[PDB]
Amino acid sequence: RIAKEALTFDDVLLVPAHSTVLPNTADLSTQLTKTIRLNIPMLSAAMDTVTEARLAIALAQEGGIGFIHKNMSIERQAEEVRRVKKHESAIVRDPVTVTPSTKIIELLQMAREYGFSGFPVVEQGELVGIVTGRDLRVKDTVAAIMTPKDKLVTAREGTPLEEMKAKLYENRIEKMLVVDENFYLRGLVTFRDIEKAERKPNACKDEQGRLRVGAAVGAGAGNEERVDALVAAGVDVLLIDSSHGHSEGVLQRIRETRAKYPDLQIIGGNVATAAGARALAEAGCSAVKVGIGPCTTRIVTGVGVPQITAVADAVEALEGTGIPVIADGGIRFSGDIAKAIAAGASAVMVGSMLAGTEESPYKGRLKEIIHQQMGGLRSCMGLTGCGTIDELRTKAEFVRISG
Amino acid sequence: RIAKEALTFDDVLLVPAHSTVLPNTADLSTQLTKTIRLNIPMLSAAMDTVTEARLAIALAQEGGIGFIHKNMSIERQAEEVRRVKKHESAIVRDPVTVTPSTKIIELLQMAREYGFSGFPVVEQGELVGIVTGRDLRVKDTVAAIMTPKDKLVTAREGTPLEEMKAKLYENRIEKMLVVDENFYLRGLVTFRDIEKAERKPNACKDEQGRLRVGAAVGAGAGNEERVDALVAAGVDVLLIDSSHGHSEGVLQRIRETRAKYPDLQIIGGNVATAAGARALAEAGCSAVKVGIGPCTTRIVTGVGVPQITAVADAVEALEGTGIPVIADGGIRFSGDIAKAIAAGASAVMVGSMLAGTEESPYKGRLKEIIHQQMGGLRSCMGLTGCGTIDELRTKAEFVRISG
Amino acid sequence: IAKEALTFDDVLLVPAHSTVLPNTADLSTQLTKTIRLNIPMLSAAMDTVTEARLAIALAQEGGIGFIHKNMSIERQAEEVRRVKKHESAIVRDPVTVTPSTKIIELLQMAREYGFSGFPVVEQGELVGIVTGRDLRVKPNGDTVAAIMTPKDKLVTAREGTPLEEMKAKLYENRIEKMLVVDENFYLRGLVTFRDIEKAERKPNACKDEQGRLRVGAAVGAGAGNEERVDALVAAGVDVLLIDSSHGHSEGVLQRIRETRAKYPDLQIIGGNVATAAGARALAEAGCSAVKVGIGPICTTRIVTGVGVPQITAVADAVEALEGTGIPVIADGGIRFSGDIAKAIAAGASAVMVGSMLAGTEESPRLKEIIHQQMGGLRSCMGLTGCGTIDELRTKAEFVRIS
Amino acid sequence: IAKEALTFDDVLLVPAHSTVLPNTADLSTQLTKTIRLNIPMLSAAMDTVTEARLAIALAQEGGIGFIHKNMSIERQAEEVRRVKKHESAIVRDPVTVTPSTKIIELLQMAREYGFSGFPVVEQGELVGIVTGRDLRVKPNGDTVAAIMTPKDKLVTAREGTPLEEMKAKLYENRIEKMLVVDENFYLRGLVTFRDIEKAERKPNACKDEQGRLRVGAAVGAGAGNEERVDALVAAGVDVLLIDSSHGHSEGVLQRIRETRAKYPDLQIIGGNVATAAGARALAEAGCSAVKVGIGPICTTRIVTGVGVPQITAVADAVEALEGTGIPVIADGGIRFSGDIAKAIAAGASAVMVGSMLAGTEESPRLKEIIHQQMGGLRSCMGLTGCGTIDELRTKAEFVRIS
Numbered sequence A, B: 001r002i003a004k005e006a007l008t009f010d011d012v013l014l015v016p017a018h019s020t021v022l023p024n025t026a027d028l029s030t031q032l033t034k035t036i037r038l039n040i041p042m043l044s045a046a047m048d049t050v051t052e053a054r055l056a057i058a059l060a061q062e063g064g065i066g067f068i069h070k071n072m073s074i075e076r077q078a079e080e081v082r083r084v085k086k087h088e089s090a091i092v093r094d095p096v097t098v099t100p101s102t103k104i105i106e107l108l109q110m111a112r113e114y115g116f117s118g119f120p121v122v123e124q125g126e127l128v129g130i131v132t133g134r135d136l137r138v139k140d141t142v143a144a145i146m147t148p149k150d151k152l153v154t155a156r157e158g159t160p161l162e163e164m165k166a167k168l169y170e171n172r173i174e175k176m177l178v179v180d181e182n183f184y185l186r187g188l189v190t191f192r193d194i195e196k197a198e199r200k201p202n203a204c205k206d207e208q209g210r211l212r213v214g215a216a217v218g219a220g221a222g223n224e225e226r227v228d229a230l231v232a233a234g235v236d237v238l239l240i241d242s243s244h245g246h247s248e249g250v251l252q253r254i255r256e257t258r259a260k261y262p263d264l265q266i267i268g269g270n271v272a273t274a275a276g277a278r279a280l281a282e283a284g285c286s287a288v289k290v291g292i293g294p295c296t297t298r299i300v301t302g303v304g305v306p307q308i309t310a311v312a313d314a315v316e317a318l319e320g321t322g323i324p325v326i327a328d329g330g331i332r333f334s335g336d337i338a339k340a341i342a343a344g345a346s347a348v349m350v351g352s353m354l355a356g357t358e359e360s361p362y363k364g365r366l367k368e369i370i371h372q373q374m375g376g377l378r379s380c381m382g383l384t385g386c387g388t389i390d391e392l393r394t395k396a397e398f399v400r401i402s403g
Numbered sequence C, D: 001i002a003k004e005a006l007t008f009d010d011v012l013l014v015p016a017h018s019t020v021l022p023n024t025a026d027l028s029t030q031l032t033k034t035i036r037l038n039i040p041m042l043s044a045a046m047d048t049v050t051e052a053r054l055a056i057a058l059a060q061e062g063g064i065g066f067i068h069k070n071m072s073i074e075r076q077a078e079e080v081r082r083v084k085k086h087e088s089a090i091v092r093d094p095v096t097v098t099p100s101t102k103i104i105e106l107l108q109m110a111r112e113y114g115f116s117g118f119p120v121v122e123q124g125e126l127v128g129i130v131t132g133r134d135l136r137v138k139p140n141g142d143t144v145a146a147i148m149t150p151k152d153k154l155v156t157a158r159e160g161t162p163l164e165e166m167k168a169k170l171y172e173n174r175i176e177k178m179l180v181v182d183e184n185f186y187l188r189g190l191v192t193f194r195d196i197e198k199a200e201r202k203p204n205a206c207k208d209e210q211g212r213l214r215v216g217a218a219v220g221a222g223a224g225n226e227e228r229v230d231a232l233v234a235a236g237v238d239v240l241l242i243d244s245s246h247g248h249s250e251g252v253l254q255r256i257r258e259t260r261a262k263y264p265d266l267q268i269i270g271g272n273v274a275t276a277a278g279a280r281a282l283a284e285a286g287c288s289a290v291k292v293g294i295g296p297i298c299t300t301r302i303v304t305g306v307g308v309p310q311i312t313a314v315a316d317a318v319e320a321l322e323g324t325g326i327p328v329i330a331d332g333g334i335r336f337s338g339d340i341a342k343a344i345a346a347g348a349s350a351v352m353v354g355s356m357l358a359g360t361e362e363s364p365r366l367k368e369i370i371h372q373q374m375g376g377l378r379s380c381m382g383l384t385g386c387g388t389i390d391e392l393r394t395k396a397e398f399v400r401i402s
């Protein structure tokens, strides 16, 4: 009964091809699900050491999409989603505000805590002043030291980012207040954010232009109050994440959630076989995750399928569904990403890679890791003659290496 | 002549399957021989650093069955068996007693040595008092300080463990004396033992409810006085253990022992081929052990078959005999156990694993090792869609990995 | 300028004629004129060294520990009060439980005090007792009244009963705990079997005139020292340590004088000094005992450059106070058993230690550190021919080594 | 207080005018007034240093070893008696075998004494000899009578025969062993070829008036010292060492006085002291030699704080005994050959060592440790101009180094 043969990343190499593709001109975009299109093929995994609201924003601005983890309160997990959801490429709807009668003592705690010293001043939604770093080098309430209503530089909602950069610079100020017909605060946008959005203009957003975001839950029932709470928080894609997704209890959860939310984008995981991939698709998954022990699952449980064979078997299973496959774990170096995609994955998940970054809960700023990795994928596509992630997943051939 | 190909644990992985099996509800029981059923698929090996009476009791209470080693006197080996055999789940028949005229000086040596300070007091079988830790904080003979006959809390043989827990608690005491119609001591059972037997209620016992136990001998004749002495001591399964069990001298011993004890459960080992497995079965083995160099046997002698192929070849050989196969040695991690079973073993032997424990002759208590390992097997069965050890040995498919 | 000054390591004790064995030597010494110790050892007033638990253990070995001042004034009083409520083996005001108490709260009440034996009291009267045995099985959720040994089955002894007696009652009933009661069956205290055995094996407890374990506490320069003083005096502290990085200050001397005024009665330890004139200041300000040690953590000297090597320091204080009957404690610099003996030989009437006990069970086991430290002292007493601490303070001779 | 005190490392020996070569220097020195050594070295009374085997080897190099007191009184007497039964090269009371003895027991009798040559004695008379040669082949199981060289083929010498003579008999017959016999052909002892060669190459054995190797033993404070004393006196010990961690005790002084009473005759070493008045006590109590060394295992000072640096110690004893003719031994602190020379120069008449020999073949090889240690002494004797130990004790000069 002891026979088949299966292949991992280190077992294969990608062959070079005639190419007209250049690294800086390859297109890194890919359909995560039939309705969500990433600009880079990367997801951050929902681990308490990788992804909360901070990194999810950082990654969606890069082109990707982060997944808030369930090792936190139901209510704290929903507010994380809302925090990403209230983000644009570079405008912050629902900023952290103050009121005129905020004491200035209580105001320096907000800045010591929040890391930015600049807040719009409000009065039940009506914008009323603004108080920033410069207005604190003295001692009373905000109202004494705030820049009053009549001198506020603002922009109506809809005005393009350039018109606000013009305005911000002409007025020699760092914070633009987005404002209503009735002067109700609708958004805050710094000079920092507009520069960081003219470069890297490939944020992954929905049809309302707001940052896309995922969230994970486990299966096993009882998660209904949670699954409902992240939907209510307007998550883009719900992750129903399992150590073994071909079990009946997981298929069940997925069947149930698809009933209560016919258009919500769901990833089920993790499978490792064509059967699991079909059953996860058949229960209602928008995309399936693949990663059974690629890892103590192997040493402890004795169970696993190496990623190269697992991905390509899930993908063969699902031809003609439009249900994409995510490769999850086993990721050592950058070229492993390229192999995973070449084996037919439409995106990859990573978590250990990003677990020490700045924007995560030994460090780095996210934009540099994503750059080194995405430059590696760019190299590969130029070498394989593959302009789009579409081309790579279907064109590039493999070669088997030994030692 | 230099051709075949053979597979070890690290050469294979177990594939995931559709599953309705949960770890905490999988059934770990398996037929060791046609008449002995373990509750977990584990044997401890008969090594002077692993298994004597202490660990054999510890393991049989867990579900398994330990094998007393032959690196000790014939007479000391039989008394080890009797010691396990006089154990129930949690009642000690033939406790360590005293008599009223035992000096109390000689009594503290018994406690310094034996590790428990509580002994029933007897007078040629008649129970007569009891002396425990509390009765020593003074200085004469036992008779001065013992709790007299008329105040002894006892229970007739047959009373359930709960009725004795009731009685022990109602009387605010830690030791229950099991007693005859004629007040002859028949057993001792502490409060400790009843708690440790309400949890972990899967002790592996015979039809008299007494702890099961194995014992090893070598072949090569002259062992007859020993083989007879362990039978006389009421061992459950005799191990006739050899570096090479397909030799004629071992087949012979086994043929002879089966003649003198037609219903004694015998394991012969070790073989590594279908031929050896058939010949060991044909000589009269209840179960065959498989492990030729999986180990200096390999480096020194140059000889061996990797376990995965050896097990599955022995098991194919023996289809339709009801003679089970034990995988022996080569065991690194927990998932190796699962692979061995999946290759068709009905139990596994381990020894190095348990060589530092508490209950063995760098440590641990046995119940924790057996827990971590059996939880690993439980993981695997949930992943492979396999509820019983029966299902695992016959359903779960394999996948071949390289590097 | 420049006068030579020796540390412990610069000296060695001379063997003299000896009629003293280790087992013979008398380790007792007068802390102050009212307070005599049974081993010449003090615990430092440090958050990682001495609190109520350790101050009771030191006392049971023969010494005194000092409760640190890193607490609210009220919390420290209870520490000191907690020590004071231990006699020989009796334990006054033991923790009780009411026959209402739920067992889920009773076992809640177990994991934090450590023990499981609580007397059951119902608004003054003593009605039962629960021990870990009664807890073993859930009654059926009911309360403590449904597991307890009841009043008509309580084994008690009248207060004043000899300790050897209520031990024999304890053996005869085979029970671990003894209830001590007044003539109205009111709970005077709890005495366990374990305590009585640690009172034959530790007959050298440094106790009070009412039989209570002894204890000290430290106050500092903080802007509420006055009230800290009074809290401890009223909480019944045996000795007060006005403790200073630099006791030859006018701030300390102030406090020392102001306190001896308000409390003509209270045994006072002032420190630290390292000079004769420093010792005179603390004495004349009204101290019972001077603590010496400025310099002997070796960052005092490094960051500041200030210090006096311990042996010269101790011996200048002793000499500056020659005739006054004011004792001198040696604080810090003490690594080995042999440093203790040198401190006492230079005239210290007792020794303070902190980091030598900082990782003990009683620290925030200790029976053993004291046994080997005091065992070396005994060795040294035998080798030098001094069987009384007062002998080793005045008799032993020194030799300069390189 | 405080008088300076030097160790070995604090001093250096001054070169003086010298007419002495290393080969010239006379290493002999008077242990006591009856006992003179040929090298100024003693073995310590330690379970891992000196027993009968080593006490014979030290004696053959010129010194005396001391049998430890970690034994039954009777077992120690046999140790001491065992040493005493070696003359120059003769070996009295050698192990014999009876013509009954089975060879399976004879070879059993080989692996534990080490050797294979046993004289064969049948109830007094000498009847043969078996050596490893006769054992080589099984006779056919028979006994020793069937392999032995028989009486009519025995090569013997009459007791009193010169050692050079019975060597030449040995060569002439080409046999390894020589039997020494009285005028009745009774076995007086055994002399091997190996011994005679180690008696020309080691002509400096510290022997007794009957020609017997010399030896000492230690008694302690234990509750049966009296009988330990007598066992050794009767077993024929040369010197008795009443040995103490602290000999300025009234317990030792007691024992010293009580023994010199019972034995006006017996050469006694008392120790250890480290003071003049300590040396006087031991002398006046009736000692032949005082052992010095309290402090020089360096845990004496660490656990206890007590000790005197070895050089000051040795020199205070020597001076305190100036005129009495009582010698002084220096015990411990001795690492190098150069420490020995400093001890003797400070006035020690001899030196004790333990850990310097603790891992030798003769310990529970040694010819070599003594050769290099004594070779350095010779070097130092040449460089300082002292050819007699008495010279190096009184002539050499010291210089203080840092």
Ligand SMILES: Nc1ncnc2c1ncn2[C@@H]1O[C@H](COP(=O)(O)OP(=O)(O)OP(=O)(O)O)[C@@H](O)[C@H]1O
Pocket: A092, A095, A096, A097, A115, A116, A117, A118, A119, A120, A133, A174, A175, A188, A190, A191, A192, A193
């Ligand atoms: N009140 C707020 N609520 C939410 N996010 C805010 C708020 N104020 C600032 N931010 C965000 O946090 C970032 C911190 O920027 P910060 O206010 O320190 O910079 P700045 O003062 O505009 O710029 P500079 O550092 O050039 O002086 C902003 O760029 C914006 O992304």
Ligand SMILES: Nc1ncnc2c1ncn2[C@@H]1O[C@H](COP(=O)(O)OP(=O)(O)OP(=O)(O)O)[C@@H](O)[C@H]1O
Pocket: A118, A130, A131, A132, A133, A134, A135, A146, A147, A151, A152, A153, A154, A172, A173, A174, A175, A176, A177
């Ligand atoms: N949109 C705005 N309309 C009117 N005044 C504004 C606006 N944004 C900022 N200001 C005011 O301009 C001044 C500086 O604002 P800005 O955010 O550029 O400074 P800052 O963050 O305090 O500067 P720094 O870079 O020194 O930390 C403050 O008095 C602030 O209240």
Ligand SMILES: Nc1ncnc2c1ncn2[C@@H]1O[C@H](COP(=O)(O)OP(=O)(O)OP(=O)(O)O)[C@@H](O)[C@H]1O
Pocket: B092, B095, B096, B097, B115, B116, B117, B118, B119, B120, B133, B174, B175, B188, B190, B191, B192, B193
């Ligand atoms: N006389 C005996 N002979 C054989 N086995 C015994 C004997 N007495 C006790 N045992 C076993 O050894 C164990 C040691 O238990 P022990 O007597 O120290 O506990 P106990 O006093 O009943 O309990 P506790 O620790 O709660 O006070 C018992 O739990 C039982 O398994």
Ligand SMILES: Nc1ncnc2c1ncn2[C@@H]1O[C@H](COP(=O)(O)OP(=O)(O)OP(=O)(O)O)[C@@H](O)[C@H]1O
Pocket: B118, B130, B131, B132, B133, B134, B135, B146, B147, B151, B152, B153, B154, B172, B173, B174, B175, B176, B177, C174
């Ligand atoms: N079955 C019994 N019948 C009568 N008396 C008993 C019985 N078992 C124990 N005792 C008595 O009860 C008392 C305590 O018994 P138990 O075994 O509970 O205590 P222990 O092991 O000495 O306690 P500890 O937990 O303090 O070590 C003793 O006097 C003992 O003789």
Ligand SMILES: Nc1ncnc2c1ncn2[C@@H]1O[C@H](COP(=O)(O)OP(=O)(O)OP(=O)(O)O)[C@@H](O)[C@H]1O
Pocket: C091, C094, C095, C096, C114, C115, C116, C117, C118, C119, C176, C177, C190, C192, C194, C195
């Ligand atoms: N209610 C209490 N209040 C204060 N101190 C207590 C109390 N109970 C116990 N102690 C202290 O704790 C110790 C006894 O605790 P413990 O509960 O472990 O005794 P025990 O179980 O009855 O004796 P053993 O464990 O030997 O069978 C005593 O030394 C005693 O000082």
Ligand SMILES: Nc1ncnc2c1ncn2[C@@H]1O[C@H](COP(=O)(O)OP(=O)(O)OP(=O)(O)O)[C@@H](O)[C@H]1O
Pocket: B172, C117, C129, C130, C131, C132, C133, C134, C148, C149, C153, C154, C155, C156, C174, C175, C176, C177, C178, C179
């Ligand atoms: N003074 C007393 N009077 C009456 N009953 C008592 C008394 N002290 C304890 N008991 C009862 O005796 C039993 C427990 O005895 P004890 O307190 O001496 O041991 P324990 O510390 O609970 O047990 P263990 O040693 O097993 O931990 C309980 O039923 C308890 O209520």
Ligand SMILES: Nc1ncnc2c1ncn2[C@@H]1O[C@H](COP(=O)(O)OP(=O)(O)OP(=O)(O)O)[C@@H](O)[C@H]1O
Pocket: D091, D094, D095, D096, D114, D115, D116, D117, D118, D119, D176, D177, D190, D192, D194, D195
């Ligand atoms: N019977 C004996 N009794 C006591 N000592 C003995 C006895 N026999 C030998 N010795 C000691 O052992 C040494 C000789 O032992 P050994 O048996 O090795 O001599 P050997 O074989 O005759 O000489 P070689 O080995 O050089 O040929 C001597 O130095 C001697 O002191």
Ligand SMILES: Nc1ncnc2c1ncn2[C@@H]1O[C@H](COP(=O)(O)OP(=O)(O)OP(=O)(O)O)[C@@H](O)[C@H]1O
Pocket: D117, D129, D130, D131, D132, D133, D134, D148, D149, D153, D154, D155, D156, D174, D175, D176, D177, D178, D179
């Ligand atoms: N004094 C003696 N008189 C007669 N025969 C002797 C005498 N000494 C030894 N022999 C005999 O000489 C033979 C052995 O000679 P010797 O004892 O000198 O050497 P050995 O130590 O046995 O041998 P080896 O050097 O080979 O170990 C034996 O036959 C022995 O009995």
Ligand SMILES: [Mg+2]
Pocket: A133, A174
């Ligand atoms: Mg700014």
Ligand SMILES: [Mg+2]
Pocket: none
């Ligand atoms: Mg700025």
Ligand SMILES: [Mg+2]
Pocket: B133, B174
């Ligand atoms: Mg007990």
Ligand SMILES: [Mg+2]
Pocket: none
């Ligand atoms: Mg108990």
Ligand SMILES: [Mg+2]
Pocket: C176
């Ligand atoms: Mg107890």
Ligand SMILES: [Mg+2]
Pocket: D176
């Ligand atoms: Mg030879």
